[PDB]
Design a protein around this ligand. Structure first.
Ligand code: FAD
Ligand code: FAD
Lengths: 436, 438
């Protein structure tokens, strides 16, 4: 009931959304635990921008997984446009998806464009690309590039400020946040008679609840045996600081994304920094799995640098698109952790062996744009009224992860077109921003 | 009569006056005085500009006339000196020069007048992409609609005309030339005559400055100190600056001059203030007032202003829309009008006066005088010494017969804007830029 005690582990993208939605449904006793103050330095959703896109599928070209995803993004788009908690942070500037070989371009055509009801604008030449943004922004030769522009129902979101907005509103509606170490740093789930009855934090305190929701992003994989359903995987981002005049052209830009090179989004309003992500299948940090002798398990760590090879990939993206920026010094960089499920659908379900536990994990590279509404679906799952087509897709499904190949590229491209391992990156082979 | 012990007065401490003072000093003239109403660099000198275009072209045989052959002689000498003379060399940037137009007629005029006669090997620019690739990414962003052009890669570029003039002034001073600059003390109001010859100059303070020879090199202002018999038309063009930001400016380096003969040109941002200069091209403004000595006739009279007509700003922004549209709406940081004087054939006028042999005139820059800075004082000193070389001397001679019944509104091979000579007297008081006004 709305009087039952609930604990949410993780005050990131999905945890803050969940807290807000539970408060909105009249839940009176909700406590959220995080080792860090919002926004957490290790939250994937702690980012000056993320991509938001919604596409409806053609009737004749639907499958269950993509139909479920469309249901998530349909709700998200409506909320980004109408919910005052989120509306200020959605910039509906459009979204370009592109590649630079015939194989990549065909893949996009077949998987993204043809199944979709969206009316795309086709971009055939370098001039087509450059004309999508104001003069002086795109200056590159886009060698071999073709792609498609989705003009509306897409853009970017200020994920960090949207998360803070949700946090603030959830507090206003009476949600208690314990965010800080050691008091919010959960070190174990607490079991009694085969069920989860709450969480233990690093201060020794045991927090008891009628329901416990595990929404701690990539860090969740350390708190529960997910039976290989989660792969903690990292991607890489860097910023360039734009100057006070030049930055004024760089406004209201569609997202530009080449699925095997990277993407950038327009400079932020606060620091005037332009973010580039270099696209690749991801880094893992493969260490011995303590519970599975002879096996490996990807284990997150935090770092505000990126591998030199990642910087180089970013500068190659800039060469193609904005070569006037390709030699600019980085003002900031970091690695950023999410977790992939085996099919890269979300994992939102009550645990079959521990029914008081709900897991809400597996953003799989697509969780941030869900922020406004994901907590509603998670609350639905808590209340056993998650609609069936979504439910069946995001169910607990360890049978799909038996003998998982951690080095599967899972429909990502770029760089060496394989999963990379941070254990193979030399200590001296990182960016050194702010070091000298 | 003439020797290096002889007193010389130079009227006008501008582009040509400072060059002349330097050359006289180098040649060992010991008693040289230069007069100007203003301290160097004068605010009304056409040479007082953060950049000007320098270009030299060798002509094919058959494709020159004596006038263009003379001009080539001037610019050949100038180029060699811009690349070598320690006083001038630091201020020449050999970045190249693009000449272009945006109609078939304009493009054909350039082909036949500039390209075909020239020994230069040009790079042809056919497309917008061709143009944009002449400069670093982020600089040229426009569509260049209808443009075609030719790029001249070497033997051309831009000069820091203001700093080069200051350099020449400093070195003339160091070598012992005396500069009287300021008003009234250096503001010459008349030449002084005795026995039908010129014996010096009278300044606004009533003082008479006497010398054995007098050189009149006062630019457009020369026209009010001597009866040039209509050989000079004082004519003004327009420039404005945009202030570039500290990051964006770093791409705008080592740029060839871009010039559309019916729209304008720009040159790269200056090192000190990061200001990007645009000139809108047109046949010129005159300021037509009654000729005090020719009843019923008009005479163009210069005045100074650090604004430009709003119509000129608009033409400059039109040029930017075609080429660098990301800049086309930027506020101006500075603008002014800038005066030169055209002769009837836009060759220079450098000669002893046939009725007053102690007077040498060195005038008529005709839109092409600034690039001559390093060497023009040598030619002027040659004329003073009656040894101006044969390749130029008859082209730049005193020639009032060419100016009889001169049509002041002839466009004299310029294009752009309304394609006619414009009149400041028809520009409304409220129709100027208002930079720096509350
Ligand atoms: C580089 C990069 C680019 C991306 N681009 C996009 C995109 O453009 N669009 C998009 O939709 N998605 C994007 N994603 C994916 C998106 O960021 C994630 O799917 C989403 O943010 C995950 O949300 P989350 O709440 O599960 O995890 P997070 O937002 O990471 O939140 C997890 C929280 O759990 C906390 N936590 C950790 N350990 C514990 C503990 N022991 N106890 C309590 N709390 C704990 C952390 O401090 C953190 O606050 C991207 C991800 C990355 C890395
Ligand atoms: C906007 C514009 C752009 C141009 N672009 C180019 C270019 O790209 N390349 C190029 O080669 N040329 C160019 N020119 C032409 C060039 O500037 C002139 O031909 C040259 O500067 C003329 O030099 P000058 O010494 O005759 O006159 P100025 O440099 O004007 O000097 C005349 C001097 O005489 C002084 N004076 C005036 N009245 C008196 C008086 N009563 N007594 C004493 N002194 C007096 C003034 O104070 C001034 O210092 C341009 C001109 C303008 C207006």
């Amino acid at each position: 009931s709305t009087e039952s005690s609930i604990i949410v582990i993780g005050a990131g993208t999905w945890g803050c959304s969940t807290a807000l939605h539970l408060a909105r449904r009249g839940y009176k006793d909700v406590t959220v635990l995080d080792p860090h103050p919002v926004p957490s330095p290790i939250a994937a959703g702690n980012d000056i921008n993320k991509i938001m896109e919604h596409s409806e599928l053609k009737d004749g070209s639907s499958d269950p997984r993509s139909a479920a995803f469309s249901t998530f993004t349909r709700a998200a788009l409506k909320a980004w446009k109408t919910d005052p908690v989120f509306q200020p942070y959605f910039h509906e500037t459009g979204f370009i998806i592109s590649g630079h070989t015939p194989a990549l371009i065909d893949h996009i055509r077949k998987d993204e464009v043809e199944p979709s009801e969206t009316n795309f604008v086709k971009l055939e030449t370098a001039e087509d690309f450059r004309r999508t943004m104001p003069p002086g922004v795109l200056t590159g030769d886009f060698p071999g590039w073709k792609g498609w522009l989705h003009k509306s129902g897409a853009g970017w979101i200020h994920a960090k400020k949207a998360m803070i907005s949700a946090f603030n509103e959830a507090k206003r509606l009476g949600v208690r946040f314990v965010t800080g170490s050691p008091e919010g740093n959960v070190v174990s789930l607490v079991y009694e008679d085969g069920d989860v009855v709450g969480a233990r934090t690093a201060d020794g305190r045991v927090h008891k609840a009628h329901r416990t929701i595990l929404s701690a992003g990539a860090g969740s994989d350390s708190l529960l045996d997910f039976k290989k359903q989660l792969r903690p995987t990292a991607w890489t981002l860097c910023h360039i600081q734009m100057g006070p005049e030049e930055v004024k052209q760089y406004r209201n830009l569609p997202v530009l994304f080449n699925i095997a090179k990277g993407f950038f989004m327009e400079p932020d309003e606060d620091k005037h920094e332009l973010k580039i992500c270099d696209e690749h299948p991801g880094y893992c940090n493969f260490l011995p799995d303590p519970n599975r002798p002879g096996q490996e398990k990807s284990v997150p760590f935090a770092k505000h640098q990126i591998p030199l090879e990642a910087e180089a990939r970013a500068r190659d993206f800039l060469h193609d698109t904005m070569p006037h920026l390709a030699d600019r010094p980085l003002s900031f960089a970091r690695i950023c952790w999410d977790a992939d499920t085996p099919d890269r659908a979300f994992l939102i379900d009550r645990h079959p062996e521990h029914p008081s536990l709900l897991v809400a994990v597996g953003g799989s590279g697509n969780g941030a744009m869900q922020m406004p509404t994901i907590g509603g679906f998670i609350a639905d799952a808590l209340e056993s009224k998650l609609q069936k087509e979504v439910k069946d897709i995001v169910r607990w499904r360890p049978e799909t992860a038996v003998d998982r190949d951690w080095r599967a590229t899972q429909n990502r491209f770029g760089g060496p077109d394989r999963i990379m391992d941070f254990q193979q990156v030399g200590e001296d082979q990182w960016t050194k921003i702010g070091e000298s």
